[PDB]
Ligand binder design. Structure first.
Ligand SMILES: CC(C)(c1ccc(O)cc1)c1ccc(O)cc1
Ligand code: NA
Length: 222
């Protein structure tokens, strides 16, 4: 499938978390580091989305609405995929892999465990990079924003991305005629974990103890 191959080459380069070596470890350092990483990823995600067929033709508003509703799912799918060959560890970046203890002192035990639940299921399904990038695009198009202007156009985008997944699976996984649907059935857990993550960091935002940059702040306040 061409769309899949296109998404593959449009995949952005890895990013480093770069936790400050002079700062003492604490929940504030972890959260600050993670949100800092996320801010930089959002910049790249925005650029990445321009490569998705038909995305740049939507109105700026609709493009923004889709992103404001899907940003967390995209960010989470990323750490999920990066962590597939690991055990009980989340690879936020090559230089930032969180084990159970780290999640604990960062107050992210329940959230990271949900992310690990996502990882568990994808490991069992043997999620391929081709499927990961297509799911990321589908997640963006199917984000369910409450403010979409051109419903049909967004539906059209969802349809083209779904067709790519179906096409890919029909030609690459003939042994399982229902693999495309299984992939789609993983989206609910992604959506569920993201809704909680957004609520969690929104609260962290209110507490005011963790500095956050412009873009991250913009998505979170959406
Ligand atoms: C949004 C968040 C700061 C993040 C940062 C970077 C990333 O690649 C993916 C997600 C995050 C959400 C939930 C979570 O449990 C840990 C980190
Ligand atoms: Na979605």
């Amino acid at each position: 499938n061409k769309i899949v191959s296109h998404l593959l080459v449009a995949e952005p380069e890895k990013i480093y978390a770069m936790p400050d070596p002079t700062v003492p470890d604490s929940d504030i350092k972890a959260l600050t580091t993670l949100c800092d990483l996320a801010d930089r990823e959002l910049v790249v995600i925005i650029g990445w989305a321009k490569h998705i067929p038909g995305f740049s033709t939507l109105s700026l508003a609709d493009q923004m609405s889709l992103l404001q509703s899907a940003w967390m799912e995209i960010l989470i799918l990323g750490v999920v995929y990066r962590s597939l060959s690991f055990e009980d560890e989340l690879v936020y970046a090559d230089d930032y892999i969180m084990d159970e203890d780290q999640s604990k002192l960062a107050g992210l035990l329940d959230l990271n465990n949900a992310i690990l639940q996502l990882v568990k299921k994808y490991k069992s399904m043997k999620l391929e990079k081709e499927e990961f990038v297509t799911l990321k695009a589908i997640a963006l198009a199917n984000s369910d924003s409450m403010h979409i202007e051109d419903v049909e156009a967004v539906q059209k985008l969802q349809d083209v991305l779904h067709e790519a997944l179906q096409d890919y699976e029909a030609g690459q996984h003939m042994e399982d005629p229902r693999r495309a649907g299984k992939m789609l059935m993983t989206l609910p857990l992604l959506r569920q974990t993201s809704t909680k993550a957004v609520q969690h960091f929104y609260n962290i935002k209110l507490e005011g103890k963790v500095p956050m940059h412009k873009l991250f702040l913009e998505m979170l306040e959406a």
